[PDB]
Amino acid sequence: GNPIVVVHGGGAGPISKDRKERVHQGMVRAATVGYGILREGGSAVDAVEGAVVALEDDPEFNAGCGSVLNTNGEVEMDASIMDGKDLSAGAVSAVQCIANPIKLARLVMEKTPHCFLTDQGAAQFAAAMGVPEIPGEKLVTERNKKRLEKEKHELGAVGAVALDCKGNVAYATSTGGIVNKMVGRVGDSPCLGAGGYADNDIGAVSTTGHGESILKVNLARLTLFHIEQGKTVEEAADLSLGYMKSRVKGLGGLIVVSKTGDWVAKWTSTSMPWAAAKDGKLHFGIDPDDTTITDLP
Amino acid sequence: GNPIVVVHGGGAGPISKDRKERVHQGMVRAATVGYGILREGGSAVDAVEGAVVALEDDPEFNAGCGSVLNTNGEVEMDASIMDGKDLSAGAVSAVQCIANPIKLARLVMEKTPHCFLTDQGAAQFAAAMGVPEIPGEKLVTERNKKRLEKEKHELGAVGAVALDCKGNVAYATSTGGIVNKMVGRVGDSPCLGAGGYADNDIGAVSTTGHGESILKVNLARLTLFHIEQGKTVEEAADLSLGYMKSRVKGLGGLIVVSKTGDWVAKWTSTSMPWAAAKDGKLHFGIDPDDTTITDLP
Ligand code: NA
Ligand code: NA
């Protein structure tokens, strides 16, 4: 089978002229890691995790380092990961002082009889697993400090989907949330069916945008229902995002990969950084009708 | 239209002959409150909340007072509530030292721009709203201390669905989780699409059983997808519960109410206490195909 990886940044407004190149490099890097894992025969779960670790470590993206700040100027993160073979999953919410929430979500999946850990319990589990505690300041960027001050005086998670050489599908979603959010606010990112969904019998979805809207419509599972009903990945993505817009006035985006290798990146927001790698080619874009295709050997 | 309320207890193993009468009285009381709200012209949301507050206050049920204990012998609770008209929702996870997590979930829905709060931030929000702090000890029961010791030395959430006189549907789900759970473990109950789902265009579902399994299959939203495809409420519940059993080896139960007034209580566990009130009649049961019908003014 031909493996595919699709990655996305936040499903938010227009991006600054010079920030677009840092964003472009970040998306290329995430898709390169994801695809590289797939091309050596790695699993879909390792591919989506690898892609999302890259975006968490990148201060340009709203996950890990570069996470938006809550009302107290702190970084509180959420993440979920799912394997489409057995529907096994791991999720974390309101996590702090760790570099990679998606790796902690992977440890919840592999090392516990549970799939979702939160706040104090997720921090205690991270310590028991030997996950290093990093100072909160190391996750905080200057651009985010300014965003918080701007907001106080008046978006979207990162993710990845993959299809591996064995026919397995997976998704990973990670976020810092929304600027100036309440303490302990949980978005759609750690919630299965909302932040993403992966099932080998259908495909895999990872979403971004206004978390409350994504939660209310169960955006990731809804997209896969349309595929089950015979719609293409493009029709499914349009129908489910269109429904979020009309029903709950929510904007956002998503990436999909079907079990047959069809993929798409769609959004109702102004932009959504995205990249896809398949058959030695890299597809990239931010704005509608700005897609670039290059060789990815 | 003719309003309906359906309530459920934990979808778990067999119940002792003497506890069966206390559970019965509890189910009757929850459905009486729910139905009483509906009969005076109250909303579906108020009805499901009223029914679940009764089960939270009842020490016989795994929600509020009577919640199972985590690995530290503490009560950590989850709850979600959803409004079918606009898909508005409120949810809380890992909440402590409050009598009624469903009322706090209602507060998240009505008083914040968010739908889900967790642990410390949920505790801080409860204090800011004037919700009284109760000694976490007032939620702990002797039977649950013994259960924890038994488990260490070696189930299921409560809920309600309703259809009101104006055609609105709602669900409420509340839990103490699973005995000896890890600190900060989040189950299906506060996760929209898993713990429940409400949509006026389809109906409302509230689930119970093994939370991790319910999360992985998105049990509540899945049930409603079968209704959308033309299945009866009975076929939808059987197909959704059957899929959870075959795909992730999970057992549990659910209650459904369609927008047209059809309702059902189904489970794959040994038992599931349930009660339904419609057209002045009360339907009650715990074991398969053993149902009592009485008049309910
Ligand atoms: Na980052
Ligand atoms: Na109770």
PDB file of C-alpha atoms and ligand atoms in Angstrom, chain B residues 54-67, ligand 2:
ATOM      1  CA  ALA B  54     -31.787  13.262  42.361  1.00  0.00           C
ATOM      2  CA  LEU B  55     -29.378  10.388  41.377  1.00  0.00           C
ATOM      3  CA  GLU B  56     -26.317  12.465  42.432  1.00  0.00           C
ATOM      4  CA  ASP B  57     -27.867  13.108  45.898  1.00  0.00           C
ATOM      5  CA  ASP B  58     -28.858   9.401  46.200  1.00  0.00           C
ATOM      6  CA  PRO B  59     -25.945   7.403  47.776  1.00  0.00           C
ATOM      7  CA  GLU B  60     -27.131   4.253  45.908  1.00  0.00           C
ATOM      8  CA  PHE B  61     -25.913   5.698  42.574  1.00  0.00           C
ATOM      9  CA  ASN B  62     -22.348   6.233  41.193  1.00  0.00           C
ATOM     10  CA  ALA B  63     -22.657  10.105  40.840  1.00  0.00           C
ATOM     11  CA  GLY B  64     -22.346  12.894  43.433  1.00  0.00           C
ATOM     12  CA  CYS B  65     -22.850  11.281  46.867  1.00  0.00           C
ATOM     13  CA  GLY B  66     -22.146   7.553  46.287  1.00  0.00           C
ATOM     14  CA  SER B  67     -19.445   8.100  43.609  1.00  0.00           C
TER      15      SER B  67
HETATM   16 NA    NA C   2     -25.350   9.480  44.030  1.00  0.00          NA
END
